[PDB]
Automatic annotation (TrEMBL), chains A, B:
GO terms for biological process: isoleucine biosynthetic process; L-leucine biosynthetic process; L-valine biosynthetic process. Acts on leucine, isoleucine and valine. It is an enzyme of class 2 (transferase). NCBIfam families: ilvE_I, PRK06606.1. InterPro entries: Aminotrans_IV (IPR001544), Aminotrans_IV_CS (IPR018300), Aminotransferase-like (IPR036038), B_amino_transI (IPR005785), BCAT-like_C (IPR043132), BCAT-like_N (IPR043131), BCAT_family (IPR033939), Class-IV_PLP-Dep_Aminotrnsfr (IPR050571). It comes from Thermoproteus uzoniensis (strain 768-20). The gene is ilvE. Pyridoxal 5'-phosphate binds at H53, R56, Y157, I213, T214, T250. It catalyses: L-valine + 2-oxoglutarate = 3-methyl-2-oxobutanoate + L-glutamate; L-leucine + 2-oxoglutarate = 4-methyl-2-oxopentanoate + L-glutamate; L-isoleucine + 2-oxoglutarate = (S)-3-methyl-2-oxopentanoate + L-glutamate. The modification N6-(pyridoxal phosphate)lysine (covalent) is found at K152. Belongs to the class-IV pyridoxal-phosphate-dependent aminotransferase family. Keywords: Amino-acid biosynthesis, Aminotransferase, Branched-chain amino acid biosynthesis, Pyridoxal phosphate, Transferase. This is Branched-chain-amino-acid aminotransferase. The keyword Secreted does not apply. It holds the Pfam family Aminotran_4.
Length: 297, 297
């Protein structure tokens, strides 16, 4: 067992895909990354919303001032080449990461050129498919006036780490974070939805959350299924009182939340319908959505 | 030209001191680092407050939940061995960095063991010794309720990057950041002092700043010199109206601020006295302080 990894145009062994410990990306949290799934349906391997993830990678890089010298098209091709070169025929999580490979102590990162690495890794479920127990954590989500939280920027994730570790140490599966204004915004690595009186609600972008591609997927799904949907701020009380709640994300997929700070919630019907639909979409069984699947072979 | 670098007990070439691009330290800003100077006085090479920096490295790691399997003593010896092994006889900036060397997508970083790398690099002045022009930037310093800013934690520095880049792009030498409550707290990589009516003032730790070892040095210096000193919050207006102001830091040393957002300040007498004293201290000419100098040879 040793898989290949794309790195600035070249396939190398995992063991050779390394960056100097003096990199300002390692020292100062200055890079961007992505999370992309590929699903095996029995007949092919499909990368889900590949192009969308690669355009977001570049939006992230533009947001933080990182120069990524590749286009979204190149990056997309790179993913396909990398999955091929390994001959995977199973569910993958794909990690592109863009970082500075030059050693540099100076915070002045102007004019640097990012490298990109892409790894593909066998991956099953991230959260219990039957539902997870969640805790609102003491750590607040980092705020837009301090760090650009809408970007999937590496240094921001120290915030997600504090959150994730705190919930897990206390026995739970996942953290929920509030923003600076006390609104429910995000799991450590998931966007969040609740259902209240048959309306689906998810915090708006302006609340300071990652603009998740799963989130966006679920918004279209709700459009198709005729489920009324509001992008509206959510408070802790609404979460405690929700008829249902669930997390969404590339790794997380669609996962029900069956407990929040000891308050029990049903594994609910809207969650279930959305989870079933999303599975059909990613496995290639919904014709309308095939433009979002990139065949590897 | 190729220098040696300490890495988990072993001296290796810079080119071999590399970490997998899948490291949660690279992907999620989860590590800690230090900044340590060594000064050449003509007769020896002295590392300044080595032990203090290494104990802070470990406080940082304890703060963010990173397990560093070395003691401050070991880390100190490592620095000396590394400077020796390179045979430097000149001014150095030393970068220890503690990070996770295992590849890992999961945010669950519990139970991991950090590696440490230590590099030493020739280094002269960071900011113009005659004084710098500074701008209060649009980016706020990250807040304690979101990230542990008192630690020298890698992912936090994306905040310092946004600040430093913004000031430099607009033509200035350095950024000043306000905290969430609007108080002047820190440069992108410096603590800040002002002098108002002959009293030296620097923001208190609780304002959300790095507990700088230079800052601490200057507080003792002021004690010795009989300069009244307050650890008190500073507002923008006080900075505009200061009789003098200056930045301090390992890299920065003691640097006057001669302009803030177009408002001119004198290169002042207290700044000068503190800069002259600090130089004498680090070059070994002040007997009282010799316990803070570690001879390399
Ligand atoms: C492992 C870190 C989590 C990681 N990010 C997913 C993620 C999301 C949802 O984003 P999307 O639906 O675009 O996947 C929301 N919020 C955060 C903090 C995330 O990490 C993931 O790649 O799934
Ligand atoms: C290159 C990043 C700046 C870096 N940190 C120094 C530094 C200080 C002052 O700390 P000390 O006096 O302990 O050095 C204050 N504040 C910040 C944000 C810093 O980066 C330095 O190593 O000097």
């Amino acid at each position: 067992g040793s898989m290949k990894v794309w790195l600035d145009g070249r396939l190398v062994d995992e063991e050779e895909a390394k960056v100097t410990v003096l990199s300002p990306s390692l020292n100062y949290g200055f890079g961007v990354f992505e999370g992309i799934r590929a699903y095996w349906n029995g007949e092919n391997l499909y990368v889900f919303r590949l192009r969308d993830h690669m355009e977001r990678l570049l939006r992230s890089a533009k947001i933080i001032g990182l120069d990524v010298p590749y286009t979204a098209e190149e990056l997309s091709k790179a993913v396909v080449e990398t999955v091929r070169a390994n001959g995977f025929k199973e569910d993958l999580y794909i990690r592109p990461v863009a970082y500075i490979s030059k050693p540099q102590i100076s915070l002045d990162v102007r004019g640097l050129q990012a490298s990109v690495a892409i790894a593909a890794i066998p991956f099953g479920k991230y959260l219990k498919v039957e539902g997870v127990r969640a805790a609102v954590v003491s750590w607040r989500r980092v705020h837009t006036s301090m760090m650009p939280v809408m970007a999937k920027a590496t240094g921001i994730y120290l915030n997600s780490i504090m959150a994730a570790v705190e919930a897990r140490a206390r026995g739970y599966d996942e953290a929920i974070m509030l923003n600076a204004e006390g609104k429910v915004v995000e799991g450590s690595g998931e966007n969040i939805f609740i259902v209240r009186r048959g309306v689906l609600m998810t915090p708006p972008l302006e609340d300071g959350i990652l603009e998740g591609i799963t989130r966006e997927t679920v918004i279209s799904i709700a459009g198709d299924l005729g489920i009324p949907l509001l992008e509206k701020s959510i408070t802790r009380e609404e979460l405690y009182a929700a008829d249902e709640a669930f997390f969404v994300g590339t790794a997380a997929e669609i996962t029900p939340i069956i407990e929040i700070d000891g308050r029990v919630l049903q594994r609910g019907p809207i969650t279930q319908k959305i989870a079933e639909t999303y599975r059909r979409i990613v496995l290639g069984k919904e014709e309308k959505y095939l433009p979002w699947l990139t065949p590897v072979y």
